[PDB]
Amino acid sequence: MPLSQLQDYKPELTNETDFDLFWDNAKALSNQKPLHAQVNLVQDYPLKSISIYDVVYDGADGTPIHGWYVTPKGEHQPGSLPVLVKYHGYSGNRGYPNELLQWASMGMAALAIDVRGQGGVTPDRAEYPQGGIPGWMTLGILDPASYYYKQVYLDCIRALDFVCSREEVDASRIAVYGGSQGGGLALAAAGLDSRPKLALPVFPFLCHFRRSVEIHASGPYVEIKNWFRRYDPEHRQEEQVYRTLSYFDGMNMASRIKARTLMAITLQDITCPPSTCFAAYNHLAGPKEVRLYHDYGHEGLPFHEEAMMRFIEAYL
Amino acid sequence: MPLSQLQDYKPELTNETDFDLFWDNAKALSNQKPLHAQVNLVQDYPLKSISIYDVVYDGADGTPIHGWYVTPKGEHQPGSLPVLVKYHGYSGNRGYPNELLQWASMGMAALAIDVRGQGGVTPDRAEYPQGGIPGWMTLGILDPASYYYKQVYLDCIRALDFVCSREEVDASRIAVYGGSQGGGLALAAAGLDSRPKLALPVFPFLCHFRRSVEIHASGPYVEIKNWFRRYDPEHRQEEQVYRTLSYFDGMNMASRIKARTLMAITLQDITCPPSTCFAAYNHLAGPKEVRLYHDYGHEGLPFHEEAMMRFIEAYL
Amino acid sequence: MPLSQLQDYKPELTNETDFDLFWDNAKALSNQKPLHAQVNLVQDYPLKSISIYDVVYDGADGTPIHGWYVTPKGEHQPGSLPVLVKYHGYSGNRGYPNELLQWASMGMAALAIDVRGQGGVTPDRAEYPQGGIPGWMTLGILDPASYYYKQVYLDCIRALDFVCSREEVDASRIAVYGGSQGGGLALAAAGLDSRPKLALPVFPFLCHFRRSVEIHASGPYVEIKNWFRRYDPEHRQEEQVYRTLSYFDGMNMASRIKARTLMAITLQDITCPPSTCFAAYNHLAGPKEVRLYHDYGHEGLPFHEEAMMRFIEAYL
Amino acid sequence: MPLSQLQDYKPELTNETDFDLFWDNAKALSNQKPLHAQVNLVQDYPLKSISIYDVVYDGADGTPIHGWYVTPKGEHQPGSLPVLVKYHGYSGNRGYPNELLQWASMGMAALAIDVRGQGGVTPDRAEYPQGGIPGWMTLGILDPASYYYKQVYLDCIRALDFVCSREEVDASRIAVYGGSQGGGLALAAAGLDSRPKLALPVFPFLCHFRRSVEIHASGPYVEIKNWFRRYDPEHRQEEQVYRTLSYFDGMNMASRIKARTLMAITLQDITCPPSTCFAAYNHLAGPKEVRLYHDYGHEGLPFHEEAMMRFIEAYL
Amino acid sequence: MPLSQLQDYKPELTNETDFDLFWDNAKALSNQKPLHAQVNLVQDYPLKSISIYDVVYDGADGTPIHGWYVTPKGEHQPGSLPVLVKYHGYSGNRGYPNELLQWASMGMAALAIDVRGQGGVTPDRAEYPQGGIPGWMTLGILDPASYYYKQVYLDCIRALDFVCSREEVDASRIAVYGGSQGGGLALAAAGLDSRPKLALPVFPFLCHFRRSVEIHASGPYVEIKNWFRRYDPEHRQEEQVYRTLSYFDGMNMASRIKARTLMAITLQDITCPPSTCFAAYNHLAGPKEVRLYHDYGHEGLPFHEEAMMRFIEAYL
Amino acid sequence: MPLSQLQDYKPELTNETDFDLFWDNAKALSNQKPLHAQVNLVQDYPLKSISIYDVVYDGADGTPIHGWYVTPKGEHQPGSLPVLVKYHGYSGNRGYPNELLQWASMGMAALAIDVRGQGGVTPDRAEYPQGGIPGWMTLGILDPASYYYKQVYLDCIRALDFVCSREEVDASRIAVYGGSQGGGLALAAAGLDSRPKLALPVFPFLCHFRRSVEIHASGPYVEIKNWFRRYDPEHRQEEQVYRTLSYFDGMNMASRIKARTLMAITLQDITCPPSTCFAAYNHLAGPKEVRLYHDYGHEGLPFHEEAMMRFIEAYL
Ligand SMILES: [Zn+2]
Ligand SMILES: [Zn+2]
Ligand SMILES: [Zn+2]
Ligand SMILES: [Zn+2]
Ligand SMILES: [Zn+2]
Ligand SMILES: [Zn+2]
């Protein structure tokens, strides 16, 4: 897709008429299950200008979700610290505490959590009706009530609960952030919950699934293709598959975001094609900015750090 | 490693002292769990020379294992039919019933089963303490009691319980067969159970783990290397990782096989490298024969089918 | 080409006005040359349900063409058995007798032949006026009377004469099938001869030659571009190259097919692109069905075996 | 090379008798050229807990070398701040000020400089006798006095003079750090200068040149091979090429390092192969530690940040 | 862009209003530096049929440009000999004198020169305000006056002055030739100077710069993309970049060429895309002819030698 | 293999006892069959310093062999011109008359011929008993009397009868030259016939077949490996295959060469590996010289032309 085409690219929403009903039912599941947040301070870490906490809280179905919570060292009044909540890339994990340093040295608290079952210490306790393709995208794909990303989305909202359980945190100054899957999950946390003030998705995955699969996006979108290869080579269940996926689709989530958003889009990206990123961005309901990186694909953006900082200082 | 060294290659066993104890505990756990076999005749399949059953039995933890059970059509006396159990490759499934025809046309019954959680309708109900690398090789890798392949090997022994429960089947004429993961599973079945008379591993996976990994074998062995990359970059838990895997290592299973064995090894194979295949082959306790395909890798072997037919006709 | 355009794609036929006269003359060559069939029962083969014959008969120019002819065991009444003729892929051969087991267990005969000069025991005794590119697609390319595929199309017709010469065979129940080049040869056999009742081409090669070269199909179509590279850099003989190949083109054959046809088309195929396959399917002159496999390329299709067996049970 | 041998690989020093005399003459010539340091406070950076200066100093031939110099915010006591000098990888640059954040938040000053002529605003004003291969590895390669890395190794040392000219900086607590080319530059700086107290090379480039080229390392070592291709196909000038490179070789620089060294070595690295890194490590004249990452090549080492930081805290 | 559109493709010229004034200011400053042309006869080169000279003249900034100059043997009259000047590919050099033998066996003189800085003995003495990407495409890119190909273009013209100052040579029968980079230089040579009678560009590089970058052409055009990556990720300096490059574009030069031009264009070339070559061709102002090699990419064209010889004989 | 042991690598000759008898017999038949050479002068070729002839002679089995025969223009005394015979690379052809110009300008006659069946107008009249792999390496491989290179070798010896039958040629000053397959044919022409004075093989193909195959050389040796994949997966026919190829092997030919030889060997060559070329070099019987190009693979060698020209001046 050429560029002035991408910038007006606004395909029709795929949300089923029961989208909000499905979600507030899923949120009722979460409301009945307490956080039971365990927070243990790490004192053997060499950075020293920040406080580092090892965190675990219960997901809606009892899965213990692990994170790192970091603050500036020193005394903080109740409701004084802004907070950034960071979600991570497909197969990754909470990372190391020092990657939250930038946020803490701006005066902010920050949280990085594991996505259940991925390459960390957080397991996946949900049960699925059938097997799948290596990875997570195809687990429970035939029914949205059992789909892998239902409990993931709920784990991501309960991270906002954890931050607001801390009295030093200012609940009116929450940003959600992430690259790729991380960016998908920030769109969903800002789409499903009212509390986030800013969203900063970078090349978000989990957007416009039908198109992503159709144009042979690389990376984890190929799992959905491999699903059809093994389960349904004539595409007879195609409709059930894309219907299930519509409830988690970032484009549908974007139509319900009122938070101010800064999106980063990379024009040579073949894992999260920019037409899927622009699909979501142009359905954003609140004010928004975009950074277009013409010659970058799915990879590190060291220059984007400073743009995110400016944005946060201006509006958080 | 050159061919004449391949066949003198007999590295030390890595079985811990309690290998047999770990397994007969896991087996006694399976012995308390009835199979609850359900069978259902497929009506209107194009082949009318065979009867085809859609089959489900419970694993030891209650997971419903699906399969296909195929016999020559018509009457058979109790205890008359020899039987072949087929196990499938990594990520695959029970396949299609026409792939078991060959066996039925030789007057045999045959069963193919799903491996739990892979590309089939058979899910994985076991719980793991942590997440993992996409795939199944790293689930529960820190403790053999909770490791993925524990319940897989038990499902595979329970496939022998299923075929032995068929009244038409002759329980003294059972063969176990599979390629790659399939071949590893057939060495497990024959290693952990006395009933199989023949074992037909094709390029068996799950053999000589520490060598597979260190010589940088491609395919699923790479998940173990990626475990290290994410969880343990200085290899401080390498000892626990390879002691977990030793309980499941086909080289240690081979040492308890008394069945007559026909192994295929492909000399250009970078996925199940031939030194790891030879290492298990050179520890087989019973009679054995090998087919060496010099210019083939990890790929379909059209000529091998005939070689297995002759072996089966001669000895089963 | 996008799926909705693909299905309606029906380009102009390239057949020259003397297309049927050429083939009439080429068939008169075949009429001069008797078969001299030799049939020899294969002994000690492990499948005892079937009788397997090792077969040779002469091509029109005298080339000994070898095959496997397989029947159900025991005697059969004159004219009783339906028969399947199998043609193989580019560089392949007659295969192994066990690959025709499925047809015998359905109560049918079957025949698999070598294509002349390819990777079996059947040489190519035709003489060509010039050299060529490695392979067979460019031999004699400047004159259809001397082109590689004339004597090949005639050996394919003579395979049908071989089967009708068998006492047990029913001439009114002949099917022809094959994949890739075999699919092309099946199209040729049904379009040039009236005897075949069914045709089952899978992603057929030798279709819409000028398109297949122009869009840069991989695999053997590349030999034609290489021909221009070596013999005709400026495309001065372009019109004569495409004229020669128009006489062998499956799209032209398909317009003369009255047999009922089941075609498989793989949508990601880059060796036999689907626009070229559909170009033939949409010129077929008899009843037709298509199976379209969205996420497969040029590869094995284990699900298609059952679709073919059903088609043959229904219609042969 | 297998691991235990690799850990003890200590090949013979290639330094000419000349080596210290050559560098004595090059350094004396540099000391005739004032620094002419210019420093400009960056305003309107979003962080605010650090002071950020845009920095330029003269190289020994007048080239204006650019950098970022970063301190914790506020005034500091004379001679109080430890300092980290970071040199960058092949083709890169001084990066972004936020990348020096972690050093500053430990109480340290930090300087990141451009390597002359590579991907930043610092040109290269040195003149060379011939042309060369794209890149910088082959510029002046027939004469050590005109070789690209002579003015580069002097620019790096003059970075130590710029930090020492800052009143806040403690000259007895200097650490030199870098990855790849930067690891190479760090070994040179610590080897040709007596001021660095710590060296932290990550998979250093510019070590054991003759072995690097002849085991066909990837990356910029390829430029040297291409030099032979273009200028000397039969290797008649090879002894002059390797004599030149010997004055720059990290292994020869290591035998002159008395500073305490922490080296990161990647085992699968094919750009800076592990034998070349180990050759240097085993010639280091001071106290040393190694981190050996088995499953990592030429890539980011995020776990390594924590290890450098603990090392800086115990010893800087 | 398909074949019939390619041929008519005549995009708008990008030359700025001051294009002619940029170039007569660059020539003014070239005019003031005398050629200082020196020659030197090579002794026992094995071809005795030809006179072989090792040659050196000064570029406009005193860079000494080395060449091979070849004439038919013995002494010649004043003004008798026609002459062909050959420019070389990206990163290459003057070649070997045997490569000019064919032009000399036609009773011509021939000159092949090094392009400054590339893979020969000729250095580059121009100074640039910043660094660059490895290679030469990005040196001085922000400023037309400081751009790498300014002095290159001037050295290519002064090659003309060198041949025109040899007594044997006939200034009215000058041809300029070369492949890829050489093709672009030949374009610029015949477009900036009145003297060449014939131009023979082969798949010229340095043509239609914006298009070459935007369609992801391989080879050196990718350096301009890597420039934006490293220096300007949001393309805020896109305009100055392409402006600079417009002073050097073959398209703009070709407008001013009144000489007679034979252009080889390769339809599968991904380094020098046929659209950019046809853009330059359809802007030629004098007579022209084209050879369109359909199945050739960026490579040797042994058949094109004869065509160039025919064009020369007929018109030089 | 490392260079020191390459230079002393002289493995065992694989010639059978009947190697000389085989070739005695094939040459006796060849000697009974006249050449019936036709020779027609080419007109309107732009060069003029040369006389060019289109040539055709009969092979020993009746294939018409086509070539180009080139001399200095004008008349010449009987027996006065030395001659170079050029054989081409695999899939190639006689090339263009301008590529012989170099040899003509030295005062020589030059002949380039076609290899039967390859990318020219020369067909292949031989009959083979079986099929093969695409290309010509496998044709007739189970029997030396029918092997493809038997009649090629004889046609190469008949190129010498053709040049000796020309009045102007000096039969005592024949040189045979070629690269890759051409180098193999040069070695066979010098090993089978007594007339050539010089041999100039460049990276000879057709050497030490068993090694080349078993170390996985790319290019046409891969045909022999593909022969085992298709015909003989378990290598039951490996000694018949290598016995056939031993009759054609350049290493065995080299044992019988009396002529003076200049060999170019490329050290990074993966198509014609250097140990296979050294195996031949080290069995040469007469005097010899080598040029080792250390960083070159299977590609053009523009510096080698001059060294060959020096060799020919010195010794022809
Ligand atoms: Zn959707
Ligand atoms: Zn182990
Ligand atoms: Zn056509
Ligand atoms: Zn050295
Ligand atoms: Zn432009
Ligand atoms: Zn041999």
Residue numbers in the entry:
A (entry chain B), B (entry chain A), C (entry chain D), D (entry chain C), E (entry chain F), F (entry chain E): 6 to 321
Tell me what the authors wrote about this structure, in their words.
Acetyl xylan esterases (EC 3.1.1.72; AXEs) catalyze the specific hydrolysis of the ester linkages between the xylose units and acetic acid, facilitating the access of main chain depolymerizing enzymes. We identified a novel acetyl xylan esterase (PbAcE) belonging to the CE7 family from this strain. Here, we present the first crystal structure of a cold-adapted acetyl xylan esterase from the psychrophilic soil microbe Paenibacillus sp. R4. However, PbAcE, which is derived from a psychrophilic microorganism, showed the highest activity at 4°C, suggesting that its structural and biochemical properties are optimized to low temperatures.
The crystal structure of PbAcE belongs to the C2 space group and contains six molecules in the asymmetric unit, forming a donut-shaped hexamer. The central tunnel of the donut-shaped hexamer has a diameter of about 18.5 Å. Each monomer of PbAcE is composed of 11 α-helices and 9 β-strands. The conserved catalytic triad residues of Ser185, Asp274, and His303 are located inside the hexamer tunnel, with a neighboring putative substrate binding site. This hydrophobic putative substrate binding site is composed of β4, β6, and β7 strands and α3 and α11 helices. The β-interface has also been identified at the dimer interfaces of PbAcE. In the PbAcE structure, the L144 residue forms a hydrophobic interaction with Y133, stabilizing the β-interface loop structure. PbAcE has a relatively more open and larger cleft in comparison with those of BsAcE and TmAcE. The B-factor distribution analysis of the PbAcE structure showed that the values of the β4–α3 (residues 93–101) and β5–α4 (residues 119–152) loop regions were lower than the average for the whole PbAcE structure. Notably, the PbAcE β4–α3 and β5–α4 loop structures are one and six residues shorter than those of TmAcE, respectively. These shortened gatekeeper loops may expand the substrate binding site area and create a more open active site conformation.
